[PDB]
Amino acid sequence: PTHLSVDTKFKTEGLCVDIPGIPKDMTYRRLISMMGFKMNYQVNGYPNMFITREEAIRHVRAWIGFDVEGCHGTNLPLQLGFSTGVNLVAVPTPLMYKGLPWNVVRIKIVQMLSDTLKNLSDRVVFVLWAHGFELTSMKYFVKIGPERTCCLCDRRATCFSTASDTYACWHHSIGFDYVYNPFMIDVQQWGFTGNLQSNHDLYCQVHGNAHVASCDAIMTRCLAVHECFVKRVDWTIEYPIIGDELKINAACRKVQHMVVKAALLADKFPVLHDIGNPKAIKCVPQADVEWKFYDAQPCSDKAYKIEELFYSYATHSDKFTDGVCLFWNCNVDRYPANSIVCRFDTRVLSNLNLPGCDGGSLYVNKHAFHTPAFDKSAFVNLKQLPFFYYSDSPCESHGIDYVPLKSATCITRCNLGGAVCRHHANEYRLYLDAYNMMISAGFSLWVYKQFDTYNLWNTFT
Numbered sequence: 001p002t003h004l005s006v007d008t009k010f011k012t013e014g015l016c017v018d019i020p021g022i023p024k025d026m027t028y029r030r031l032i033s034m035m036g037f038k039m040n041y042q043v044n045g046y047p048n049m050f051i052t053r054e055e056a057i058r059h060v061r062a063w064i065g066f067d068v069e070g071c072h073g074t075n076l077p078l079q080l081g082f083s084t085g086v087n088l089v090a091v092p093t094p095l096m097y098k099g100l101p102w103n104v105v106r107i108k109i110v111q112m113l114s115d116t117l118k119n120l121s122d123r124v125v126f127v128l129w130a131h132g133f134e135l136t137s138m139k140y141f142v143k144i145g146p147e148r149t150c151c152l153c154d155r156r157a158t159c160f161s162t163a164s165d166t167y168a169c170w171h172h173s174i175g176f177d178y179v180y181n182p183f184m185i186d187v188q189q190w191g192f193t194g195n196l197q198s199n200h201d202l203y204c205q206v207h208g209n210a211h212v213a214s215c216d217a218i219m220t221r222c223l224a225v226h227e228c229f230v231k232r233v234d235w236t237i238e239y240p241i242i243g244d245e246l247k248i249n250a251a252c253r254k255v256q257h258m259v260v261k262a263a264l265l266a267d268k269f270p271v272l273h274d275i276g277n278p279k280a281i282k283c284v285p286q287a288d289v290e291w292k293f294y295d296a297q298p299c300s301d302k303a304y305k306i307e308e309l310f311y312s313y314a315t316h317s318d319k320f321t322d323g324v325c326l327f328w329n330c331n332v333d334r335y336p337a338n339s340i341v342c343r344f345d346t347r348v349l350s351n352l353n354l355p356g357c358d359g360g361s362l363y364v365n366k367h368a369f370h371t372p373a374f375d376k377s378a379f380v381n382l383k384q385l386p387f388f389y390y391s392d393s394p395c396e397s398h399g400i401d402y403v404p405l406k407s408a409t410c411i412t413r414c415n416l417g418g419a420v421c422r423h424h425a426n427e428y429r430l431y432l433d434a435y436n437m438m439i440s441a442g443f444s445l446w447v448y449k450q451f452d453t454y455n456l457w458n459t460f461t
């Protein structure tokens with residue numbers, strides 16, 4: 001139970017308009033053979049070109065929706081569409097390119113996949129809504145064989161060059177012409193009634209249908225993401241480290257402690273309502289406040305209605321208007337005015353944030369989290385939280401070459417007294433780096449309108 005058996009049955013109804021007369025009884029073994037590929041019984045890490053839903057979810061960073069539309073089947077040109085928005089036209093002789101032979105088209109496919117995937121994944125997973133032409137066109141740009149390594153590094157081989165007879169990963173494939181050992185999954189195999197557009201539109205209004213192959217490719221990957229990350233969630237799946245995951249997560253913990261500690265000192269709320277992660281611990285353990293936790297799992301479809309988070313059935317709910325409410329990555333439609341909020345901005349461009357369903361995004365950092373679309377109106381009762389650094393720690397060095405720190409946002413006893421000490425200057429610079437790391441990763445901070453750092457200076461007396 002690791003790979004998809006080649007002898008698994010493949011439902012062929014979706015393929016019969018492009019391939020009339022196709023047998024209803026069909027295996028992956030026979031389908032692959034029909035596509036022009038010879039597996040010759042090989043136990044070398046590539047048992048099937050097709051993979052299970054579970055293997056696809058483990059490799060979501062590799063997903064590339066692919067669709068082929070028969071413009072005019074050997075004698076006709078084909079429109080090759082990708083979920084990157086690219087449309088290529090291959091002639092047998094929203095970025096739309098004119099008709100070119102396969103020998104040049106395949107060089108473009110390798111360039112595009114390599115640039116899109118080199119910082120995301122060790123492979124490609126073609127996400128299909130298979131009708132026939134996409135499967136039969138694969139032989140014109142795909143080569144298969146045993147698992148291999150790059151000619152220039154230790155990464156697995158994803159590309160092949162006929163000019164040099166060598167193999168490369170996504171980082172070293174410049175000038176390569178063939179996709180090597182790609183994987184693929186047919187979304188139609190999951191049991192769907194009706195066509196791609198009708199199933200996609202049930203959950204998403206952001207992707208339209210301009211009737212080009214890239215629109216179908218985008219809709220296909222969108223629908224796959226809804227099925228695997230929106231309606232079905234698995235937070236037990238671990239994903240590899242591809243970027244600043246560790247620094248971002250450490251920054252988030254530093255920022256949360258800083259902001260919450262400062263809010264409690266400036267406004268002295270008697271009670272804090274910590275709403276979100278059922279596994280959460282107190283971010284400011286030494287604070288005076290009555291800390292009360294409320295469980296809400298990360299919402300992956302629509303943002304929580306604030307009224308449902310306070311809904312208590314036949315009993316009285318806790319008083320949310322007393323003290324402060326802390327929503328650390330707990331996505332609601334409209335935050336109460338007495339809130340401290342961290343909300344991920346789904347629009348952020350990064351290697352951790354993949355395009356999602358209905359304006360939302362799939363943020364992949366250790367775990368995959370489909371996040372609802374960022375909506376500025378959720379924050380109408382609050383203001384953006386400005387950067388500040390606060391510290392009550394003693395002015396002592398212990399144990400880097402100096403330029404004295406001058407900043408109005410270094411809230412320390414030394415700055416109050418006229419001159420920032422070396423320890424607080426080092427800590428301020430580290431904290432500003434962590435803050436910038438967290439912000440550039442996509443997180444946004446919001447706070448109740450009465451929040452004022454001027455109230456922190458009198459904590460030094």
Ligand SMILES: CN1CCN(C(=O)Nc2ccccc2)CC1
Binds near residue numbers: 309
């Ligand atoms: C039966 N329970 C009663 C308690 N309950 C709430 O009090 N929710 C809540 C959440 C955050 C702040 C204040 C109240 C949910 C339903």
Ligand SMILES: [Zn+2]
Binds near residue numbers: 152154155172
């Ligand atoms: Zn390489």
Ligand SMILES: [Zn+2]
Binds near residue numbers: 200205206207218223
């Ligand atoms: Zn969509």
Ligand SMILES: [Zn+2]
Binds near residue numbers: 414420
């Ligand atoms: Zn100091």
